[PDB]
Amino acid sequence: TVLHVQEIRDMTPAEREAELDDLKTELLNARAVQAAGGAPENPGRIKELRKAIARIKTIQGEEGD
Amino acid sequence: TGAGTPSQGKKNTTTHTKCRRCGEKSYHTKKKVCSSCGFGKSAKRRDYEWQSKAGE
Amino acid sequence: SWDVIKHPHVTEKAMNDMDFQNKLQFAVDDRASKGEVADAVEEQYDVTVEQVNTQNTMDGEKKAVVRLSEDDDAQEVASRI
Amino acid sequence: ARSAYSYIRDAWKNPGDGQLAELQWQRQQEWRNEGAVERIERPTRLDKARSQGYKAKQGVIVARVSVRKGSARKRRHKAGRRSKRQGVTRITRRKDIQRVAEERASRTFPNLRVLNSYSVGQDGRQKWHEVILIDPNHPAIQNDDDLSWICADDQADRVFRGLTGAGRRNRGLSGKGKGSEKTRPSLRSNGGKG
Amino acid sequence: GKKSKATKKRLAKLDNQNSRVPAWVMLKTDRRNHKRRHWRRNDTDE
RNA sequence: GCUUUACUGCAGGCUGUCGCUGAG
RNA sequence: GAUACAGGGUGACAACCCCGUACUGAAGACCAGUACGCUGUGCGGUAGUGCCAGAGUAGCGGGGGUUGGAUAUCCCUCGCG
RNA sequence: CGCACGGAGGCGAAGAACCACAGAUUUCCGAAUGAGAAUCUCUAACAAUUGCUUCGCGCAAUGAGGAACCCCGAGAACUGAAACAUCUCAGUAUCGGGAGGAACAGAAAACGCAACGUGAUGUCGUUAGUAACCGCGAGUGAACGCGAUACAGCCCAAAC
Ligand SMILES: [Cl-]
Ligand SMILES: [Cl-]
Ligand SMILES: [K+]
Ligand SMILES: [Mg+2]
Ligand SMILES: [Mg+2]
Ligand SMILES: [Mg+2]
Ligand SMILES: [Mg+2]
Ligand SMILES: [Mg+2]
Ligand SMILES: [Mg+2]
Ligand SMILES: [Mg+2]
Ligand SMILES: [Mg+2]
Ligand SMILES: [Mg+2]
Ligand SMILES: [Mg+2]
Ligand code: NA
Ligand code: NA
Ligand code: NA
Ligand code: NA
Ligand code: NA
Ligand code: NA
Ligand code: NA
Ligand code: NA
Ligand code: NA
Ligand code: NA
Ligand code: NA
Ligand code: NA
Ligand SMILES: [Sr+2]
Ligand SMILES: [Sr+2]
Ligand SMILES: [Sr+2]
Ligand SMILES: [Sr+2]
Ligand SMILES: [Sr+2]
Ligand SMILES: [Sr+2]
Ligand SMILES: [Sr+2]
Ligand SMILES: [Sr+2]
Ligand SMILES: [Sr+2]
Numbered sequence: 001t002v003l004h005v006q007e008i009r010d011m012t013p014a015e016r017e018a019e020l021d022d023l024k025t026e027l028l029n030a031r032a033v034q035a036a037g038g039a040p041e042n043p044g045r046i047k048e049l050r051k052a053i054a055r056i057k058t059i060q061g062e063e064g065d
Numbered sequence: 066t067g068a069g070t071p072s073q074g075k076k077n078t079t080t081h082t083k084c085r086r087c088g089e090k091s092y093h094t095k096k097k098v099c100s101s102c103g104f105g106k107s108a109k110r111r112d113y114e115w116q117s118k119a120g121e
Numbered sequence: 122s123w124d125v126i127k128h129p130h131v132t133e134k135a136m137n138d139m140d141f142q143n144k145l146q147f148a149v150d151d152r153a154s155k156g157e158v159a160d161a162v163e164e165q166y167d168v169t170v171e172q173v174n175t176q177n178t179m180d181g182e183k184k185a186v187v188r189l190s191e192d193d194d195a196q197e198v199a200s201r202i
Numbered sequence: 203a204r205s206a207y208s209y210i211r212d213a214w215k216n217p218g219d220g221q222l223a224e225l226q227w228q229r230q231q232e233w234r235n236e237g238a239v240e241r242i243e244r245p246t247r248l249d250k251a252r253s254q255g256y257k258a259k260q261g262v263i264v265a266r267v268s269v270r271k272g273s274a275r276k277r278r279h280k281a282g283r284r285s286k287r288q289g290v291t292r293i294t295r296r297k298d299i300q301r302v303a304e305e306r307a308s309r310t311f312p313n314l315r316v317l318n319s320y321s322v323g324q325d326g327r328q329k330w331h332e333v334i335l336i337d338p339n340h341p342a343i344q345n346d347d348d349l350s351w352i353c354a355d356d357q358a359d360r361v362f363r364g365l366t367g368a369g370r371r372n373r374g375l376s377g378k379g380k381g382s383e384k385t386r387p388s389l390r391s392n393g394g395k396g
Numbered sequence: 397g398k399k400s401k402a403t404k405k406r407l408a409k410l411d412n413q414n415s416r417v418p419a420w421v422m423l424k425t426d427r428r429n430h431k432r433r434h435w436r437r438n439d440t441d442e
Numbered sequence: 443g444c445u446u447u448a449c450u451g452c453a454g455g456c457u458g459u460c461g462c463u464g465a466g
Numbered sequence: 467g468a469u470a471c472a473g474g475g476u477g478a479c480a481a482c483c484c485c486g487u488a489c490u491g492a493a494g495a496c497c498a499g500u501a502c503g504c505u506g507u508g509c510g511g512u513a514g515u516g517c518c519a520g521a522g523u524a525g526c527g528g529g530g531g532u533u534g535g536a537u538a539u540c541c542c543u544c545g546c547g
Numbered sequence: 548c549g550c551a552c553g554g555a556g557g558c559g560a561a562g563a564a565c566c567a568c569a570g571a572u573u574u575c576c577g578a579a580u581g582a583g584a585a586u587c588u589c590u591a592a593c594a595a596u597u598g599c600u601u602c603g604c605g606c607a608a609u610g611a612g613g614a615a616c617c618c619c620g621a622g623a624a625c626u627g628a629a630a631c632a633u634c635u636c637a638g639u640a641u642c643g644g645g646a647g648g649a650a651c652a653g654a655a656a657a658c659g660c661a662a663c664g665u666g667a668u669g670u671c672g673u674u675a676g677u678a679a680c681c682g683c684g685a686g687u688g689a690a691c692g693c694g695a696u697a698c699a700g701c702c703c704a705a706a707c
Contacts, residue, residue: 044557326462
């Protein structure tokens with residue numbers, strides 16, 4: 001939604017690795033708020049975070065790291 | 066001592082357990098052989114023609 | 122590839138270990154050792170770990186009780202996440 | 203003129219006469235101390251080997267196998283049997299000793315395929331046969347216009363399905379006419395009456 | 397009895413399967429857990 | 443199921459013979 | 467209306483309300499790495515020549531199994547050849 | 548935004564859903580192959596058996612599965628004979644081994660409507676319940692040929 005396939009291909013191998021760790025941290029911090037059962041949540045974003053990490057890992061395979 | 070109800074009390078031994086190969090509770094933990102799939106006895110899976118009617 | 126830290130274990134007993142004993146509780150991957158849980162907590166939160174106590178919970182997951190050094194405050198680390 | 207091969211052939215017509223009598227008396231002493239299946243570099247009967255399909259090439263293997271002499275090693279019935287089915291002593295197996303030898307060899311060499319075999323004699327308690335086996339995966343054979351047929355998928359485990367010459371003879375497939383009513387195209391299709 | 401790590405994971409799963417069909421599934425399907433196992437009345441594996 | 447000098451057979455033991463098996 | 471009156475759906479019996487149905491056309495798979503075509507090799511005939519042509523085989527006997535196979539099935543085993 | 552009609556939220560004109568093809572990922576046990584183990588663990592692995600070989604696991608092979616079909620081996624008994632032993636049930640049930648998309652068979656040391664004839668092999672129809680077997684009891688039981696289907700013939704060993 002915010003991250004598209006073309007935008008990941010416009011990145012460099014080091015920008016993907018940095019975006020991977022950034023989304024993993026946003027996922028871990030979303031899973032932390034879910035562990036406490038918070039109210040200001042967004043159920044659609046935690047779903048998109050997993051798909052975005054999948055998209056980066058797929059492009060990392062296609063390009064050769 | 067009767068062979069019925071009073072002899073059932075000594076039954077606290079574990080023999081048949083969940084199998085690593087097939088998932089059935091037929092892995093004899095003392096024989097190390099599965100009574101269902103034959104794990105521990107054969108590389109081939111245990112199957113017999115008598116498990117079904119002759120013309121089936 | 123599997124990650125070491127799954128999510129923080131936040132229950133009442135987890136808070137008593139945080140407020141009184143300077144310990145943070147985490148639900149980790151069951152293939153992860155005490156030393157691996159130690160490293161991952163330091164590399165993710167920028168703290169110094171002294172001792173890690175693990176347990177294989179009746180939920181299929183592994184619970185880790187991670188004690189931080191006196192320079193670090195467990196309450197402050199749990200508040201930002 | 204005669205080939206040198208014709209002399210190895212003529213010697214083997216009578217393995218109890220001449221120089222061969224002395225040779226076999228000596229060789230069998232070493233063979234009795236050898237295993238069940240022994241790979242040998244060169245065939246004992248070159249003429250017969252070459253006649254059967256052998257070539258001094260890569261991927262062509264020969265092995266000598268010893269199988270016991272006599273009838274079936276039968277266990278007596280442990281349940282009710284009518285008089286006709288109560289025998290132990292006089293029962294003989296339907297597969298000949300040569301076919302047992304070929305199968306034992308093929309199992310010792312799982313990757314290879316049985317081409318043929320021949321007899322190399324016997325003593326009082328056992329029989330010896332040399333089996334010519336072929337490597338279907340070696341390019342020296344995949345390019346051979348005389349042996350590349352054995353490389354086909356349907357030639358896999360040919361000995362266990364009776365596709366050897368000894369297999370086909372023991373199955374009663376020699377005769378093309380009278381006598382082979384219950385044997386051709388297979389023993390199984392004819393209700394096992396061959 | 398002493399349980400192994402795998403036996404512990406299996407017993408753990410059986411306990412999780414022992415939960416009820418959530419309130420929302422009843423509304424979504426517009427109106428029953430058939431794998432309801434009791435520790436005394438029923439028997440598990442191993 | 444069991445018995446035996448019931449009928450018929452099958453193992454097993456004993457024994458001859460052939461092969462292994464050769465020299466004077 | 468119909469080269470379409472097969473079938474289904476749709477708040478009750480539907481060719482014409484909807485999917486389809488006839489007609490025409492497209493793709494994939496199988497046939498098949500086959501047929502046809504092609505490249506290369508070279509078919510065959512006369513006369514002379516006892517140079518070559520698969521052995522425990524052909525065949526015989528003892529004992530068994532198997533078969534419709536009877537003397538005349540196929541096979542195994544022991545001995546001989 | 549599956550089955551599944553909820554609540555919250557989200558994705559989609561940057562053309563999502565959905566379908567076809569191809570590709571990525573694809574935990575652990577599992578032939579299970581570094582070693583062990585009830586799906587886990589311990590300290591680099593084609594374990595085991597083979598072929599080739601630079602003789603080094605360097606290059607390869609095998610293993611196990613599949614509804615039944617197929618091929619090669621092992622092979623009952625109830626039953627029938629109004630008893631029962633040969634016979635019959637039956638080369639059936641069941642067991643061991645193995646291949647394929649089909650198997651097996653196959654270019655005559657054939658046939659033998661005996662011919663001045665046929666011409667690889669399966670299979671189908673028929674030949675025929677005929678010939679043949681059989682306490683000649685009960686039962687058992689072909690083939691050549693013919694009409695079809697489809698057709699396709701070839702390679703070694705040796706001589707030199
Ligand atoms: Cl083989
Ligand atoms: Cl004719
Ligand atoms: K009977
Ligand atoms: Mg502990
Ligand atoms: Mg057939
Ligand atoms: Mg509970
Ligand atoms: Mg019979
Ligand atoms: Mg292992
Ligand atoms: Mg009876
Ligand atoms: Mg009767
Ligand atoms: Mg009578
Ligand atoms: Mg019969
Ligand atoms: Mg005939
Ligand atoms: Na959790
Ligand atoms: Na083999
Ligand atoms: Na219980
Ligand atoms: Na009785
Ligand atoms: Na027969
Ligand atoms: Na005989
Ligand atoms: Na997949
Ligand atoms: Na391998
Ligand atoms: Na090697
Ligand atoms: Na009767
Ligand atoms: Na009776
Ligand atoms: Na009879
Ligand atoms: Sr007593
Ligand atoms: Sr006990
Ligand atoms: Sr065993
Ligand atoms: Sr089986
Ligand atoms: Sr719990
Ligand atoms: Sr195989
Ligand atoms: Sr109870
Ligand atoms: Sr000839
Ligand atoms: Sr023809």
